Amino acid sequence: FDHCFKKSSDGFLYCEGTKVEDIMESVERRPFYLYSKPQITRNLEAYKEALEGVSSVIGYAIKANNNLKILEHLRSLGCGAVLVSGNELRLALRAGFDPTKCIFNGNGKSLEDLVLAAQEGVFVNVDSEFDLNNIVEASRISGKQVNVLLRINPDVDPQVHPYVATGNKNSKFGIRNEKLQWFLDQVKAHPKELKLVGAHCHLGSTITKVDIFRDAAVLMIEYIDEIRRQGFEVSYLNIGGGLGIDYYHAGAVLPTPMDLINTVRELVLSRDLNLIIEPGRSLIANTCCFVNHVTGVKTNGTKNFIVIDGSMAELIRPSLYDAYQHIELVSPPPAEAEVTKFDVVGPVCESADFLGKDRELPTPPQGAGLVVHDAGAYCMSMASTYNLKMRPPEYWVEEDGSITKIRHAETFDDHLRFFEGL
């Protein structure tokens, strides 16, 4: 289905009509993240078409991917920005995002970062009692009123939605609906510092069934009804992020952005609410491969290993979450290459350094290209310099099949800078 990375019957992987092998030969022989700029455009356009007729902000979650060129591109197409730190807000402003389409969320927002948010006029979510006290303090410091959204855990039916219900009892995020009156009384006490403009929920990540959005929005509209009846002017419902994509490339049918917005469309329109959505994964994940070269193939007797140049330093998701990302070769394998089971592992000093397990692949020769698919979200953004494996360069392919560098490779000199003069 319609993936921007396609294996044609010639046995070559393509991005936007360009062979990945040709792209690999044109850049340095080290691991790198490869994006389709058009697939970024297609992902954004699917949300824009889904929200047509609804007053809305598409809040791209920068925590997914903080490439400045990708952010400037999304901004150029009418995107807002969702931030979880002051530095993310500085990068959004540098990328040219409108502060009236920026939302600063978080369970531990620093007073420093809240002063920046108040100064720049962005939307700020309220996560806790200490959080609201810091936002009032940031208002007093900046001398600006802050536009706030209360982050509420919707009391979803635990027999229908056990994982979300339990998540609300165990998680560090959000306000229990039982404490709502405390927050409203506090807002009413600080009219100069606080303007309550809406309510916020965020329901999880990799959501593959949209019934949770339907059921949560019904509960969020009843909270907004109650808030409006107490005389607060509420104009936004932020339903958060979390729409999933297909990681398995096995034909699974996932809900679209249209399906997601169709669950809240009529209630939002009936209440004259602006809808904020906060997608990260569903905007950037499926636009990107982590591109590798095969170091070599080995066996310990039971398991076979394809050893690559890339590692848990660049891409930790499989190790950290036991997550599946799809793996395939870039080029036709030798005639006579045996298809069998491989763990795909990096050169890093521990057994947690794997990119995938139990994958049926043609035995690749040394130097063959290999990709980890759907590597656009929470991959580069979570990269380390473990084993002094310096962070990779990034490229993208444009509509004409031309290749542009969108991030410099990190160098060893960038490690040494930290000790300069010490």
Place this chain on the structure above:
Amino acid sequence: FDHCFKKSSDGFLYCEGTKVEDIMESVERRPFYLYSKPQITRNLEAYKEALEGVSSVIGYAIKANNNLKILEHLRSLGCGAVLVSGNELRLALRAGFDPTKCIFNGNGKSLEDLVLAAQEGVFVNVDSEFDLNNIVEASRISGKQVNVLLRINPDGNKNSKFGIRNEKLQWFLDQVKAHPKELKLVGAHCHLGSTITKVDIFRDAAVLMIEYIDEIRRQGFEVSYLNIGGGLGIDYYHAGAVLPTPMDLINTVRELVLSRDLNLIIEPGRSLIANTCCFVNHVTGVKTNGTKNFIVIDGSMAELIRPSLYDAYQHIELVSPPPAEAEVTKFDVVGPVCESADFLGKDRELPTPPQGAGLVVHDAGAYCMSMASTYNLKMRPPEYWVEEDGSITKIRHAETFDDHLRFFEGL
């Protein structure tokens, strides 16, 4: 026990006689890694005394912690260096390590990195067939013969990506015989795992490694080194557990090594650097989710991923005496990062801290800073150490937002 971070009866945390609260007030209000320079010295001295009477190399595993000042200090006390990448080799040479006491290990060493290793004349392990073919090629490119150790898995191993197949031993020997100009086989290498709490396994491994070395010598190879790897564990729970000492570890192999006139290489990381360090934090706030309590700190999985990645316990306590009548209750200690995996510890019995109070994560010297990311653009922390005289020196600059922006200059 004998820990460099001590909680006085007065309710203050101390490092080498200096109050941690005093150190926090003297640096920027952001998370930082704080080390006892003296404790680094003690950890090394314990290995140095355990190895007296044995020809040996203490190969500090740089993957544990790559602070350049910590590397220089270990080098100044006679340490060797264990490396898993060319960049680690570059950093070790910059730290002034003797290439004769450097060991380059790995299951995916790059031809590039093997060329540098051959040029600099460091020991290089042999992990697989493809690896041996790469060392041979690196020898031809550099025109230097390579001193090699075969990495054996002495009988999490039917699953390991590391080491040769024991049953293919003869294949490796025949290949070394067949490349005299390129290869000199100098020894054998095993690494048994990490957080090892029972030195029995070292004893059993050494006996099997010595059978191998005897066979390799009988076939005419001049082998001088047994590299028994690292993996000695430390106490993370701080509740009186008694772990094998380095003296205990060397005592199980000492007579065997002497009887064969072998040079012993050990490759400690965790047991040189872990217990010297606290990850030092400020409390942003305390929140409740009904009966469930959270201490929210400025630190996170961006700086310290081990609890989340390995479900590892690291001890947590407050820096300063709490207010009288502060409820002692159960807390998760969590950062500001936008996901559930961002915790430093779960279900910890602590006095309710006020906003801005200091909180430490213990035994954070190993696989903590070295695995740090810029997730959520939480830029990496500065590092400080305490001297013998109780003064504080910066040993690493804090990363800045400019350090992100530099990746896009001219693009």
